[PDB]
């Protein structure tokens, strides 16, 4: 219903946003992703 379609849209948006970032796998295995690399829009739960 409302929540199911809500979740589908949210998962699509998340997949796109995370596909955007450049950080390679081996780079993140040893170094924590810094906070700057994401816009303050994705944080604070405004999606």
């Amino acid at each position: 219903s409302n929540t199911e379609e809500l979740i589908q849209n949210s998962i699509g948006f998340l997949q796109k946003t995370f596909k955007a970032l450049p950080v390679s796998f081996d780079s993140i295995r040893h170094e924590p992703l810094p906070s700057s690399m994401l816009h303050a829009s994705v944080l604070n739960f405004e999606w």
Partner: protein, 49 residues
């Protein structure tokens, strides 16, 4: 008056949200564990080969 929930239809929607969430969480929980059973079984057959 007793702990039987409230008829006020303003939290009926709150129940509706909870029903969608708890159910979806349980559905994922079991979907995950059956995948683990399928994987560990395959790995055990592979070592036997």
């Amino acid at each position: 008056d007793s702990k039987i929930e409230k008829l006020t239809e303003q939290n009926i929607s709150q129940l509706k949200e909870s029903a969608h969430l708890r159910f979806l969480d349980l559905q994922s929980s079991i979907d995950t564990k059956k995948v683990a059973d399928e994987n560990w079984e395959t790995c055990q057959q592979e070592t036997l080969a």
